[PDB]
């Protein structure tokens, strides 16, 4: 046993994995075994979801998060997002589950049987954290891998059946993407959009042409960047800016994953394109707008003139103006006027919600959809009692959007903490004071008094 | 083909269980590593075969 | 009689598994019978 | 539901997703066995 107690390693059991920092073989095992765990869950969770799945209920009434991801890719679904074939879901689950055994095998082998360090075994697989060129090479390999991943999505969309398009003319459907957006003005334009209301940065992406085009760009950027990093070593200015150690690199990635976590939270909360409401349920903004739509329809059927109906405050009860004048739904949902959805858009004119369209053109499928979304708003208790906090037990419902937003906020937050923990530790360790202040060389004692 | 399928899958499950306990114990046991390494090789090739068997027979039972 | 015969790591693992089972039963009971809302 | 041929494995499938959690708990059993050294 090498380095497997506190005396020899300097790390207590509860920091046990830090004993692995300079043992590239065992650390490869840890990583491969862990990748096994992720793949295991993806596979097993899918099979669990499928076994529990009732095809004629909406997915979002069934506590499903993985089947919705598969369906968005265009597998197993048809018009309106109706399930036409569960077999693609079965395949995804089984293939992940089988693959996890392989990863688990390699992980266990490297972790307990294989060479503890890889450097003496191989110059290609061995590494020194402080070897800047080797670090950028491995980074380079992984960037190429990621670029290929992004192009796999492009391949599915363009050449292997397409993607589920909630926006498809005549109703949501799986659609092949033949004209992906290549224009860098549009693609990178998203990146420079404000993250505030009515703009929403990248979260605002609202058509599959832009999504696919983005991944073409990202795929090429990642492959080019990967080649770049294999062929180069870090420049002088980068050398002087960073800490070059295993723990430092971990900290950079923790920071990055934290950022991505918060982005994913906002993506699933607001976006209804890559998170189709057919599969994930209505967004918070969507369901609130759907309520206003529902009662506008109801009261207009009863004879209300919804354009001229003045609410208790003086603002229109059903319809009012946004701060820039667009006609929008009234009541509290005034906040949600940036919402856009396939069931609502046919009522939209140049100036916002069109009163003549409202009076004459609302179709029964719009009433149904608005009623459905209003009554599946993403509100519910921790024990999955659907609805407002004062609602009685009866409906077993928490929106997948809530499950996915909350989990990813928690994860992103703790990852920011991990970033700070490890970035601060990497700095201190590099400078040589992570274990405490040298009693005979206490820096503050050589500094002038503040006063 | 349902007789072939349903038992091939049970055999897949059973072997997986044996391997799940067996592989790490073998890897970390001091003696009998020679006998272990071949059994692990055998189990792995047989595990892979059974996956493919179940995979093929799937389409004659679904 | 002799202290050490049954390793402490086994006692902890079994006792811990016992706690998980009983708590698990209590959670099952939240969804069935009295207190289930049904 | 799973395809009918696999229905007998329903109870097994119900349990699989929790297995990753067992790996975390296993780390503690292992450490207890080596006295958290």
């Amino acid at each position: 046993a090498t380095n497997r107690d506190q005396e020899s390693s300097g790390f207590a059991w509860w920091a046990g994995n830090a004993r692995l920092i300079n043992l590239s073989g065992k650390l490869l095992g840890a990583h491969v075994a862990h990748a096994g765990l992720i793949v295991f869950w993806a596979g097993a969770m899918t099979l669990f979801e499928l076994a529990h799945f009732i095809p004629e209920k909406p997915m979002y009434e069934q506590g499903l998060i993985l089947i919705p991801h598969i369906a968005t890719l265009g597998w197993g679904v048809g018009p309106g997002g109706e399930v036409v074939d569960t077999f693609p879901f079965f395949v995804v689950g089984v293939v992940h589950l089988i693959s996890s055994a392989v990863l688990g095998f390699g992980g266990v082998y490297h972790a307990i049987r294989g060479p503890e360090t890889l450097e003496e075994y191989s110059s290609f697989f061995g590494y020194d954290w402080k070897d800047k060129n080797k670090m950028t090479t491995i980074l380079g390999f992984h960037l190429i891998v990621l670029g290929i991943g992004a192009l796999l999505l492009v391949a599915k969309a363009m050449f292997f059946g397409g993607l589920y398009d909630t926006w498809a003319p005549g109703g949501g459907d799986v659609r092949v993407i033949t004209n992906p957006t290549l224009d860098p003005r549009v693609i990178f334009g998203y990146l420079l959009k404000s993250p505030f209301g009515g703009e929403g940065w990248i979260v605002s992406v609202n058509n599959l042409e832009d999504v696919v085009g983005g991944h073409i760009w990202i795929g090429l950027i990642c492959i080019a960047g990967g080649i770049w990093h294999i062929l180069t070593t870090p420049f002088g200015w980068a050398r002087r800016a960073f800490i070059w150690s295993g723990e430092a690199y971990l900290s950079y990635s923790l920071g990055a994953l934290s950022m991505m976590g918060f982005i994913a939270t906002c993506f699933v909360w607001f976006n209804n394109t890559v998170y189709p409401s057919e599969f994930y349920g209505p967004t918070g903004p969507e369901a609130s707008q759907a309520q206003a739509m529902t009662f506008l329809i109801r009261d207009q059927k009863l004879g209300a003139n919804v354009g001229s109906a003045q609410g208790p405050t003086g603002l229109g009860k059903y319809l009012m103006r946004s701060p820039t004048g667009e006609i929008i739904f009234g009541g509290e949902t005034m906040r949600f006027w940036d919402f856009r959805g396939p069931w609502l858009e046919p009522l939209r004119g140049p100036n916002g919600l069109d009163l003549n369209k409202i009076k004459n053109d609302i179709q029964p499928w719009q009433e149904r959809r608005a009623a459905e979304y209003m009554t599946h708003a993403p509100l519910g208790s921790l024990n999955s009692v659907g609805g407002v906090a004062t609602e009685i037990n009866s409906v077993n419902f928490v929106s997948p959007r809530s499950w996915l937003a909350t989990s990813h906020f928690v994860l992103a937050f703790f990852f920011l903490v991990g970033h700070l923990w490890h970035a601060g530790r990497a700095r201190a360790a590099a400078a040589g004071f992570e274990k405490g202040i040298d009693r005979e060389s206490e820096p503050v004692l050589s500094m002038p008094s503040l006063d | 083909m349902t007789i072939l399928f349903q038992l091939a899958l049970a055999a897949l499950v059973i072997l997986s269980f044996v391997m799940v306990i067996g592989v790490p114990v073998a890897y970390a046991s001091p003696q009998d590593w020679d006998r272990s390494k071949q059994l692990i090789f055998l189990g792995s090739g047989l595990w892979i075969a059974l996956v493919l068997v179940v995979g093929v027979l799937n389409f004659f039972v679904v | 009689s002799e202290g050490g015969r049954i390793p402490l790591w086994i006692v902890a693992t079994v006792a811990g598994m016992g706690v998980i089972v009983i708590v698990g039963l209590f959670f099952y009971g939240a969804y069935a019978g009295l207190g289930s809302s049904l | 539901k799973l395809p009918e041929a696999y229905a007998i494995f329903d109870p097994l499938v119900d349990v699989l997703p929790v297995i990753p959690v067992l790996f975390l708990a296993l780390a503690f059993v292992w450490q207890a066995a080596v006295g958290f050294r």
């Binding site: 046993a1 | 114990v25 970390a28 046991s29 001091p30 | 790591w9 | 109870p11 297995i19 059993v29 066995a33």
Partner: peptide
Amino acid sequence: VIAQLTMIAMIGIAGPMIIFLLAVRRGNL
């Protein structure tokens, strides 16, 4: 219900069994 509790019993014991078998055989824990 009986089928589900039997599965998690075999699956549940697998981990502690690995450790136990290794401890008995003076394995590389």
